[PDB]
Every structure is written in C-alpha cells, then in structure tokens.
Design a protein around this nucleic acid. Structure first.
Lengths: 85, 51, 94
RNA sequence: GUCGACAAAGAGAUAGUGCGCCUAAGGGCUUCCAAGAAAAACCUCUAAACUUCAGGUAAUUAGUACCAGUACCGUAAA
RNA sequence: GGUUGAAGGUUUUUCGUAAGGAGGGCUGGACUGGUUAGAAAAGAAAAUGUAGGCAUAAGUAACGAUAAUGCGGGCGAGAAACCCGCACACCGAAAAACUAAGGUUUCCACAGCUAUGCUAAUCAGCUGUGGGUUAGUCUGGUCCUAAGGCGAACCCGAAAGGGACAGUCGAUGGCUAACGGGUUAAUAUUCCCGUACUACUAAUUACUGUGAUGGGGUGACGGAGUGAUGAAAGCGCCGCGAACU
RNA sequence: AAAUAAGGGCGUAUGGGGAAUGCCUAGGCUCUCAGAGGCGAUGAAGGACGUGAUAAGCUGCGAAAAGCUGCGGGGACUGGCACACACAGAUUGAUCCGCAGAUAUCCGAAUGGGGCAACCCGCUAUAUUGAAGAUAUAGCACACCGAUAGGUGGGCAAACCCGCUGAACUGAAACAUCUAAGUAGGCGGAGGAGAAGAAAACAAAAGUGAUUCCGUAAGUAGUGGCGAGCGAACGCGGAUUAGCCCAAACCAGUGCUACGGCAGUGCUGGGGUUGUAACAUGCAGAACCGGAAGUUACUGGAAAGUGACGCCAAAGAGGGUGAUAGCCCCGUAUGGGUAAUAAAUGUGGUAUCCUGAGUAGGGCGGGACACGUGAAACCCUGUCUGAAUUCGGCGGGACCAUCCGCUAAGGCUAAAUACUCCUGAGAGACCGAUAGUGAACCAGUACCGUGAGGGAAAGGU
C-alpha cells in the first residue's frame, strides 16, 4: 500500500516540531488500512492519519500530458517514537 | 518446486517492493536488479499456476 | 536479417575515399546495415570535461567492405558449407 | 536567531468583574382569505421469534469514527 | 545524350506565316530525350471564381470610461509604468470581506524577456523549473422525499416502441455532534493551543419483556401587522496602561 | 574620400521576401488471381487509468503490466520510436520469427443495487483485534428449457441477400392519372453466399422436361391523360447439373374416454409417397536452409560512368550502396525442411379404401404481374360466403364445347450468381504534396457549436 515516503521542505519542517510524517499511499486505500499498514510495517503505533488527494498537471506544450495523480497520507506517530526512513 | 517450498517462495521473494522503495528514496547501486526481480516474481507466479 | 560479416573480423574497404584501409569490425548496426571498422572514417566532433575537437570512428556501408582471404591478399565473397562454416569462393580455404 | 535589514521567546497588562443611550436577531400573539408540500428521523403499541438466553435501562473504563471537496478568481485581467 | 555536368531558373543569338525550334554564358547538381505511330486529367485574362504570398490606402485611424500623478533611493547594460519611502487623488450598501454557479492550477518561490501584455520593461494571471489543498462536528454519499425519470407484472401498437401499479432513483427541501485564537511564501471550524459535544463497540455492577416491513402522535409549514423585554454592532463620559512634547 | 536634382523615370548588377517549377518518395487510386467473411457472459467493439534504471508523448502490455511459459527456426548481439551520460543480460547459446498456453485493473450488453461511463453502496459464506470504523476470496441480473446438477440468448460490426414499411424534388416544357420508385430512408434475421428450386409447368398437332446466371429474341408483342414514358414472353446458343423425404388408407404394441369386446381420440414401430396415376505409411502444410559469376587505366569528393580484356545465366524481375551495377549486398530461377492439421491406399389383378377443408372458387376493396378495369386470364388477401374425390380437380389471357398438359391447399436440397471490414501474391500508356483518401507529417487531430455535427494547414540539410 505504501509506495514511497514524502521528503519535502513543508513535511520536513514539521516532522521535527510535531511527529507528523508523510507517505505516498495507494489511490484506493482508506485511513483504516493506512494506519494498519504503517503499524505493521514500522511498528511505531500510528495515530491520526490524514489523507489528501492530488490532481494531475495536465500540461500542454508544442503535445499534452498528465502527471499521475496520487494520494498522500500524513501520519501522526506517538510521542517518543520516530520513523527511520 | 513441490508446491510447498514454492508457494511461500513466491511470497518471500517479493523484495521487489522493498528495493523499489529504497530506489525511490535514493538511487541504488545497480538499479537493473529491479527488473530482474520483477520478472523473476512473474516466472514464479507462472510456474505456480502451472503447478 | 542475416549478415556475413560479424564483429571481430579483419576486413578491407573496397569503395570510398579510403579504398584499401584495413581494420577490424567493432560494432554492427544490422537494421541500417552499417559496420564500424577501426581505423576507417576518422571524423571530427566539436564537443563542448574540457575537450575540443575529438576524433571518432564513423560508420560505413557493409557493401563497401569485403573480407580478406587466408590465401594471397585479395577481397573475396563468402559462402556457407555444412557446423555452417563460411569459406571464401576464391580459394576454398576457409 | 536568519541573511546592518529583519526578527520570534518574554514584560508593561488579571491594563473597571465600568457605567448610560441604543439594540428582534428570532419566537410568540393579532388579523385576513387566496386556506398555505411529502417522507425519513424521534416516542408508544403489538404481530412471528425466545425465555433463567439474546435484546432493553442507568453509572465507570477502554477502543473506534468511513468515502469525495478544501489552493486561487468569483460586482472579475481567472 | 549526361557528374568532361541532366532537368529546372536567368540573360543572349538565330530560324519559321504563327503556335514554337535550335545554340551560347551564369546558377543548378541527376536524369533526359530525337524519328514514326498511339492515348489524353492536353493550353486562362476576366466566372462580385478558390488557396497561399505580397502591396495601396499609411506610418494614417487607434492604443479600449477625463479617478492623477510628483520626487528620492534599489537591482539593472538599459526605468514615465518594476521594488522601497515620502507626498497627491479615487471607491468606500463600493472599486471592501466570505462564498455559490462556473473556471480546473490561473495559487507560492526562483531563473527569462524569445512569443503573449494594443508601448518599453529588470514586471506579470506569460515561459521553465521546485512546491502547495490535512475534517467524527463545514458541503455532498453512506439517511428521507417533491416535480420528474426508469419500471418486473399488466394494457396497447406494422417494427422500433407507447402507457403505467408495486417498486426504484431524483434537491432546489427535511434529519444530523464545535467554538475562540496562533503559525507557513502558499492549508486551515481541517494543523497546534484552550475548552466542549455526538454516535457505535467491548468489559463490570444494579437490572428487566425486548420486540417491525403493521397501527398511532409529532415532524408539518400562508400573507400582513406587532407589543413588552432585549443580544451582537454603534455612540457619549469617567477611570487605568503605554508612547511623545 | 567622392558624388549630389529636394525627389522622380528608364536600363544593368547585387540583396531581402516568398513559395511556384524541376527531381524524389514515407502515402494514396483502380484492379487481377486464390482464400476468408465475424467478435462476445471462459465477459466483445470502443475507451479510462496504470506499467520504464531514466519517461513528456507515440507503440506494446495489464498489479505476473516495453512483459511470463512450452515446442520448432536461428547463431552475436540485445534492453521499442530514442539518441547521450550510463547500468546490465547473452555461445551454458541470448535478442528476434512461427504456433500453441498463463495473467489480463476499471467503464462499457455490464449482468448484486444504484448512478452524473470509468464511480458510490451492499447480502450470504469463511479468515483477519472481529467488535465497532473497515478489509482478503467465492457466490449473488433477466428470458427460455432441464424434472433435477446445468445449458441457450442478450451487445457490436463493411458490402451482398431476405421480409415488413416507405417519400419528395424531378419529367410530363403547367398539373391532379402516370413517372421519379418500390428508389432514398427506417426496422428485424441468417449465411459465405442468400433467395429460388423439382410442374395443379410450357408449347401447339411437332415437341421439351427442376432452379439460377450470360447473349440474342427485342426496343418486338403489348401497355400508356394511347401523353411523358414503361416494356415482356416463346424459341435458340452456353456455364453448372441432383434429386429426394412426410400426412392419409393399412398392420402391431400401448394410454384415455355385457361379463366376448367394440368405437373414438393420443404415442412408438412398420408400410407408403404418384399423372405412361393401401388390398497406418508417404505428397501438400509456419517460420526457415542454400542459391552462379570483374579486374584494370582516366575523369571525378565519391564509379556503379567511359575504354580494354573475362565469366554466370532454368538466375539480365526489383531494391540499396558517396553518380547510372547480371558478376558489392539483399535478392531472383531451380532445389530442400517444416508443428498442428492433411493426402491415395418382384410380377399381375375384381371390388373396396386413401391422396393435404373454412381449402379451391365467388361477392366487395386493394397489390404484384410489361398489363393504369380494360375483352382482363394467372398469383396474395382485409371482410363475408363457400364445393367434389380420380367417369375428380386445375391450366392452355373474358367465356363455352372438344383436344393437350399437369395433379394445389406439406417440407428439404450443392454448382453455375452478387459484395469486400479483411487476407497472400502481383499489375497499371494511375497520382506525385493546392495532385492522390478529409488525413504521405502525433488526422477525424487542432479549431467551431449546448448538441447532432463541420473540419483544416503542415514532406525534402
């Protein structure tokens, strides 16, 4: 279900202050499955998942092309524990 | 084969979706192993359905 | 498509500005039917790793290339004898 | 502290528990003829079902809450 | 006949009653064509003919509300239009804030002035790279139904098909638990802080008739007028805190 | 430096601009020969979304996702258009080709319910904290029949063919009968063809013997506001050739509706069908294998060109190669090898009974026959009426008598015939980029409209 972790400035500036980590998850997965996947994939007692769907760019040049819309999940890991990455 | 050491092998050899995550986080030394394991798992599935 | 001149075969140019420049076949484009022989077609390339005008080996048509026979030095045509070993139809010496 | 221009932690400052005017927002009430939606939700009863079960009530603890939108313009340069 | 230079383009000479033929120089770098016979997509100057290219009007009309601009610094090769600052002016039941329909990345940062902007531009809703949308309580589904649609069965019609009961969909309506601040360049009843609420499940105690697709009550509703009391905004006064003379 | 008439006109030369012409082909057009004529509930045509070490498009392929497996061919490169920096695989024999298999997300007949196509929401069985929020696999639409385990069909798509419906413009120099035309269009079904097809037929004193198609007959007979127009048949010459099965009378078994059974109506078997009319080894068959023969000097950037001297030819079709090649390459003629499939080895007879009933005819109103109600035969019927069984019935263009032919009211049937969404081979006194398909090129694309729909330009170092 988990494809790759998100590594951007906005998510890295909050993974330190708070305990929120970003992941790029499958399109047809819900929070109940995301929590269990990160749980029995890292063992960090994930709480408070938040999902968000993105859209394709659908750019056009001189030719058209979309950019594979996905869904990103922000998990709020328990205090004291962190994800290795 | 024997349908017992292979049914579990086709599931334990799925390090393809760990090497893929490793490569997505950072480029691995030999990226051409991804295609190799992606076709080996297909060979295993074919042999498993053929029994 | 089959070819009678594989890589690693000493050949001789029979047509072109060189017309007699020997060498060894390195690469073979089978779709374009063109072989790159070392020592022939020394072309210049203006590459922008500080480098200026570099020398490179350009391709040449296989029709302008003939194998050298094990007999007296002369170009020859090749046949197939079966193993499927190829001989020269000028001295029959393989 | 970031790269002298900025600049968050903190302090004045628990800075009147201040006074007057003003304030229908809405619901009710009156009247009139032109006489002014439906169903779901909520409460009660019983038909089949079962009896020391299962279901119902009150109090405590713990756990769980899904899918899609969330940018920007929107009396306009979108 | 031709890479010792073909067709094609440009000049020149000559021949024929003409349509036309032949030769030379220049560009051009691969085909061409005599004699006899044959065939036809066989000849343009006009159809307010068609397509492409280019002129004239001509450096002419115009540059899109008569709300308005001036100066000094900054980057920069380049500044009336960009950034900063001090002045001036305009809207202000608006030219202000939220947001529906709709648009579907136009949002934010950095590089660029080619095309786009009725001018130039170091600027941009433009170009290229990196980001941005976080919900148990907000809006829809998982709940309900109106107008209307589909519609087994049934009734009609040369065929396609039409009507239509039960049923099933259909908001523009009904039901349903949250408020105030802070942060980022871009998100905030969503993240954080403070403080609450609603529904379900599993344990434990005291307990017991629970119980529809069926019956009933409520949901559940018009126009106009409006006392009394009284919120939020608004106005006035004293007190208190800070800054300045 | 020079010149100068502010400027204009003419002639020559050199520039920009543009794309014509010339040459070429990546694509098209008309056909010939031989096949094939469908896909789909084991989920079609057509899409959406994904899939690469790198991935914006196109191509290929579906969570086994530029790919997996098996059998053959093949023998050095390969990881598509696509290159470059790279990284890997591969003589243990990769890549590639032919055939046969596996996987095959979502929408779509879409089929568990719904819906605004690519979405939402479920029930029953199992397992996962199993328990709320949720998950993984399997089964859950309709109609018919099968008695029951289960089978058949939904839909899409070129033309040919069949059946049901069915115009108008136009012509008649107007127009209504008529033509256009049973054409265009609409609807349903099947096959490689379909329809028709075996005489209740023609013909005429002589005869033929199922249907279909080609040439004449023939623009004839005829029909027609006898106007425009429409237009057969007989006979003859050819392609192909093929004929058969039931109902009934009758005989057996069997079910139903006075103490022998019979009668009627069902089922199975036999009988019976007409116009002189019961009682394994070889050939072919996929990729594939092999396939002859030229040296020199000159011009030239480059030889295939020119001159000289040679060779092959069952191969001098064609294409490519720095210019024009029989002997440079791919090929061509001849010859081999192939998996599935394959290829030759009864007679006569008196009487009696049966030969398709609301059927043939007829009245009324229409349609097709070349034939428009005309002297109108023949065929079909919307409504009504309604015959006999073989010395019977029908036809020979009103009708009657005689002669001749046939035997209706049941069915099947190949060949010769029509077409091309396709397939393999091959041609053109066919086009050559305003031509040829709208489209030689990221074309039914960009653009236009709410929608049906309309629809371009764009080749060359």
């Amino acid at each position: 279900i988990i494809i790759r972790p998100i590594v951007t400035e906005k998510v890295t500036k909050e993974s330190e202050v708070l305990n929120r980590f970003g992941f790029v998850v499958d399109k047809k997965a819900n929070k109940v499955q995301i929590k269990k996947a990160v749980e029995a994939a890292y063992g960090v007692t994930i709480v408070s998942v938040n999902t968000m769907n993105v859209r394709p760019d659908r750019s056009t040049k001189y030719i058209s092309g979309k950019t594979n819309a996905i869904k990103k999940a922000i998990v709020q890991v328990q205090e004291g524990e962190t994800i290795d990455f | 084969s024997a349908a017992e050491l292979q049914e579990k092998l086709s599931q334990t050899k799925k390090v393809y979706a760990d090497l893929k995550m490793a490569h997505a986080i950072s480029p691995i030394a030999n990226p051409l192993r991804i295609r190799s394991v992606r076709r080996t798992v297909a060979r295993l599935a074919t042999e498993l359905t053929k029994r | 498509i089959k070819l009678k001149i594989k890589s690693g075969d000493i050949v001789r140019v029979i047509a072109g500005d060189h017309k007699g420049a020997e060498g060894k076949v390195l690469r073979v484009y089978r779709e374009k039917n063109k072989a790159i022989v070392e020592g022939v077609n020394l072309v210049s390339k203006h590459t922008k790793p500080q480098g200026g005008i570099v020398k490179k080996e350009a391709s040449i048509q296989i029709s302008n290339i003939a194998l050298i026979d094990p007999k007296t030095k002369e170009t020859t045509r090749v046949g197939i004898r079966v193993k499927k070993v190829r001989f020269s139809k000028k001295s029959n010496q393989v």
